[PDB]
Point group: D3
Chain length 321, copies 6
């Protein structure tokens, strides 16, 4: 029943042709949007049927980043309230297309505000170390530079997908001086790092931060040197389920993403490659979290969950049936 452009967004999400917790969330919301502008269902209850089907597909692309499930919870939720009210086919159609834009928009805005708030923590002459490719982190960095602050960013490689290359090339485009190094070099240059700025895919109620593999290692050595570790993440990066005791699943991706298939098939079969895409960073190695609602201590993650998600506790996923 699901349109084709929806199956495409979903595929590009599990192949990481489209990646990054914030972008995936928007693309998810943009999937639903397209499903509503291109739906053929002639009846409303059937339209609502397709949406729930398109939502389940999106949800199942990649597990770890809650941004995806949250974006789904935003659009699908309003769509549900509208449905259980008496939304006529063309009415729900708009409510969804609307709620879809609304989200894709507050995301764009949330990044600017995270940029403004975190950029005040960056001091002139500061050297920043980061990991992976985070729009949020980059926002904090890019904004600081534009305020006239003189910085230099140490970009870690970020294997196995070489995400450091995106950060390096992007950051260099804004004019900012970059220093690219291998992951293992993180503790070697930590002594000359002033601040550490990274993003997040999911943040647990107790302050734990799940981010691209290797983040935990960087935060560990960062604490050891007394360097700040600021995580730049929107409020939709926080995991509501987490507060119910729910454990956030660390996605395991395909091995040929680490060692190319044509080279891997050459290897002795008693050698096995494990490719975890994220890891967990303890709240004590995190000094602050920069959200579009202010700087907050890790442990204050429970406050964000209560005020923005007093919804998820009561029901199932607005796309279940």
């Amino acid at each position: 029943a699901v349109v084709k452009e929806v199956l495409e967004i979903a595929e590009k999400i599990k192949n990481m042709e489209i990646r990054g917790a914030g972008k995936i969330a928007r693309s998810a919301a943009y999937a639903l949007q397209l499903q509503a502008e291109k739906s053929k269902a002639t009846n409303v209850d059937e339209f609502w049927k397709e949406m729930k089907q398109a939502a389940k597909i999106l949800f199942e692309t990649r597990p770890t980043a809650v941004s995806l499930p949250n974006a789904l919870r935003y659009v699908m939720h309003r769509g549900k309230i509208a449905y259980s009210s008496g939304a006529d086919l063309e009415q729900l159609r708009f409510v969804i297309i609307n709620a879809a834009k609304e989200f894709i928009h507050n995301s764009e805005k949330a990044l600017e505000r995270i940029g403004e708030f975190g950029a005040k923590r960056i001091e002139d002459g500061d050297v920043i170390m980061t990991h992976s490719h985070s729009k949020a982190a980059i926002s904090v960095m890019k904004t600081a530079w534009e305020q006239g602050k003189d910085i230099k960013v140490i970009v870690t490689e970020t294997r196995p997908k070489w995400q450091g290359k995106i950060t390096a090339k992007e950051l260099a485009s804004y004019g900012i001086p970059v220093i690219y190094v291998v992951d293992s070099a993180a503790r070697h240059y930590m002594k000359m790092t002033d601040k550490v700025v990274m993003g997040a895919d999911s943040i647990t109620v107790n302050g734990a931060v799940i981010n691209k593999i290797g983040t935990a290692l960087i935060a560990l050595t960062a604490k050891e040197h007394r360097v700040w570790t600021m995580i730049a993440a929107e409020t939709y990066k926080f995991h509501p389920e987490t507060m119910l005791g729910q454990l956030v699943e660390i996605e395991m991706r395909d091995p040929t993403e680490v060692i190319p298939e044509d080279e891997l098939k050459t290897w002795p079969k008693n050698i096995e490659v494990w490719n975890p895409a994220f890891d967990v960073t303890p709240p004590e190695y995190v000094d602050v979290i920069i959200t579009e609602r202010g700087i907050i201590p890790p442990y204050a993650a429970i406050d964000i969950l209560r005020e923005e998600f007093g919804w998820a506790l009561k029901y199932t996923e607005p796309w279940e049936d």
Copy 2:
């Protein structure tokens, strides 16, 4: 004025076609041996003049690993003694060809011992994490595997030169099961690690270990989980000058080992690739150093030095002048 096989061996030490602190030291010894065998100098003074130019060449290949200079000192020091003692042309030649053989032979026996001694610390059912590629480290693991001890080794990729592919392929051939992960997975799988066994290129009098880049990071999180970190290294890995306040220098290799020339030239001028080949591990993160002389705590490195190189302090390099 020196033999071709000497300049070509020197060359491989620089291109790293020949690597590993131990193998480089032994290759160094072997070069002096070839220079003594193929030398066509009809006069002893001329000959000795030829040995010093070959030792001066080998010495200036790569700086970090003391194993190299110590192998040179071992051979050259005996040569000086004899030469000063008015040695014949053939006599001196003999002294050198025997000092080389002797070193190379002891180096190999040292690997065997470090193996037995280290292996007694690996218990049946142990999951061992390693880094880079170390003949010494592998000895400990191969030996344990051959006493019937069922173990599993987690091999970290070790960028930028993919040294982990070496260790994995090698350890596998002995049957040992291998788990291959990216360096950034170090802390993620550190909770399921029982023993950490790594090698070294140079060890300071205070017990500081200079090993492949990323070693210190693994060691950092290892202490964090109360997992023993054991460094398998021969006595000639200890740095004698260190005791005179000299710092070990960290080799900075070409940027194109991280990012290939083809693609690097593509990057904007404001991006810089830094490539340290080693890092330092404080002595408190090192539980024990396994040497052919037996196990010792990091802080005892001074005892090893005062013993072996008790005169490698004032006597200027025996290949100087």
Copy 3:
């Protein structure tokens, strides 16, 4: 003036014939019920007298666990609200038997949900270590095991009262495999422990956990090996006066509980036996607290306090004239 039952439930609390913060709080609530239930007051102003009397009697049984003065407050606070409004004799006898019914019921509920939230934190294969005997702790593990999760619990003896035996047997009844070990062995077996789950008798606003003696020791070594420490406690375990700066009193039980008097008489005058009933575990050694309201970081204890005990603070204990 008080009924017989009240006086003896108070006595069974004082000698631990009935123990365990939770069970103690209900026993106390039940007691107040029996007073209002079996009373013979022939006036109301008199009834409310022999209520503040039986409340204050119970309050003075043991001091560490707030669960007791908290349950007490819950029933009395409703009686006082009623009474001071013009409660008829029989109106009040109902208000009370009711409030006592709900707390007892609510308590039984709370354990169910804590069990459910906590179990989601226990992964299949996990070796859990516990201490003392706590219904909240047991509930989390018991729930996990019935979910299909194959676990194995290390139970610590917990002297002087051998409370560990009450835990081992019970967990054993449920078919859960157990490893019984002496308190002292906590650090020796922490290396093989995955999670540590323990109850609580009182939790402070800053998140400090007051639990059976020896708890802070286990928490300490767990942080050392980076093993999650999860305290399971109902909201009525949180101390409200702890916010106005009060300190939790640590009960000092009779020495003959450690050394049987038959023997203690044999001992010299200069040997003194001190029997702390509990100890204090800092918030930094507690990763999360499992309540019937969800999982929270130890520093969010203030949220639970403000939320459940906002009223209590400005008023005096309702059982005080």
Copy 4:
């Protein structure tokens, strides 16, 4: 255009003839009150124009302590409300003279409460170490002394302004025994210290304490010995802008407060005296903050902010324009 007693009070805040975050805030409030009482403006707009110039003067005395701007915001914010509400000349005057009195009066009551609450944490026989001179800190100690609690206070010299001589002379007058030592003795006598009680000038949303220079050092070694570090500070010591990512600036006072002009001029040009008046204490070294609203963990500072200054974020300074 503003009153003399305003410029002279502003002056003392700069010469530190009037110091202490609390006293400065109250003196600030008092100045606005005098400006309202002595103002001779016959027109309201003129009057309001006069109040803003006096608030702009007071604000630019010393930067670090937010108490000052918060006292200004308290008075000025009410003034703006009324003024915008078309207040009379006498009406506005009235609004201001009452906002000042009100603040000054609450500040004093806040000191009393912080006293009772903090004192409950000091036990009989306690040896308390302090730093600098804090009315808030002293309240906690004077109160404990007056509940019969026999205590001893170790007063640290607190250079460069010898603020410790103040605390010592003051605490002594209440009878309390005092041990006076140099700041550098902090760790030496820290082993015999039971409680650390210090004040503060500003507290960040993450619970970072900005207090007199040397505070962080004492706090560092305090954690090292497992000695509680308690910061006694009023709610208006918490920094609202902090939540928007703004860093608190550390005032750099004249070099001649460290080394006198007479002797300083003697020193060679290549010597520089740096004089930070404050330093930062991470939130993990702070056990609890004692406020008039009760005790709270460092990480809860955000709750205090969201409460008190819930609108002190967007509303530009009420004395701007």
Copy 5:
């Protein structure tokens, strides 16, 4: 072939009728004496047989404390030196009864001097906490008290064998005031402890201390509150094979020592009792070791090893054919 006495001293070691590393080592030496003393061998090659037999019998009593195979080595090593030289029947019977006399004597001496050196570390007024029952520990405290130093010792019960009772009583005999507390209370009373003195059963080359179960826990919390941890041990407590990489075996005593079989039979099949007799205390938790050769940092254990056991290593246990 062995005498009766030897077999029963071995039996009393196996059931701890005789325990305590030191006492065990002498009992073992005495035994060898009784063998050579009460033997009836009518040949020498036969004598030396029934010596290696009674030595190997004793060696196989308990494994943790090296003091046993160390005492054994001391007597046998002298016999073997003699014998293999051409020892007459009676010559050897003397060599032995002699070597056994000296070790026993030397041991008694060693405690005296350890007591003397250690007491100089105990200041008047000091509250010392101890664990288990150790003659070396008791000697240091007993000496201190007789020097005039007014001390007060906190004795930990030390389950499962209640060994603390043996300590409390003894220290009490000497007039030393004692505070008896349950193992679990270690952290609760560490705040009032000045020094911690405990014995040892084996000490490794890197300085790790193997002592009664629960020792590593006390050491851990002591470092936490920065309280000196002093291990008192004679040179024969240091493990020599620990240098060739061997690991100290931790004895696993019978479960009925924790739970009386009368009861243990009542317990379900899925409850298993594990009884570790010792645990391992890392060198970083040991500040100093008191030996009859002076005070040394835990990392100097290698000095003591090389100095007293240089010979032993290249040879096989002298009691092995």
Copy 6:
């Protein structure tokens, strides 16, 4: 019997008119020298009598720095050997005058060598933080600068004697840029410090360093930031007695050295000033010790004691009788 110039050196030592562990040691040796050049005793046994009397006087000037007792042990010892041989009056007279010079000379030399060895650890562009006034530390610093290295030194004030002023003015004379700050500022500027270099008065066998008050605090925060702490101290700064369990006494000086008498007599008598002149820094906060015999890990302090003082163990002070 003692000459007058001896009573003067001694007085200038207890009034610190002459201070610094290294200088005091030399002045002590120079006292004995003068006592020998100006002695009137006509007989040798009487001369030897006066020397022992002059030595006891010197020994009793100031307690903490072993440099004093060691210098005494050097001159007085040779003088004793000479005496018990048959030294004639004019012979012992020279032996002493000789041994006196010898020491005063090797001290001057030992400082140069400490300068050379430690200066190799200082890197160009490095910022050095120090404490008090240490010739040894200054040697390491001054030498580095002269080797052309670009440094900047952060000189802490060092109360109560304002010793920082000597370091500042001296270091500025060599041309080196200095930054003078109060003690409390130590943790504030530790973030921008690259190396920490301080001297020592006494070093215990286990690596503990006793130095000017406040040193321990600086080392603590130095460890916390991962900055090196190098202690520059001659081998005569090591405490031999220490190895015998001996505790090094922390001198307590007169209060009017902290607060001028004319101002102190004004103070309330229930205020008491404590003036400890040194404190103890743990071996774990010390990375290396630079001695005239090489760089050594703290824990290697026992090696220095054995090789340079195998004398003190056997006898009393060479000036007792």
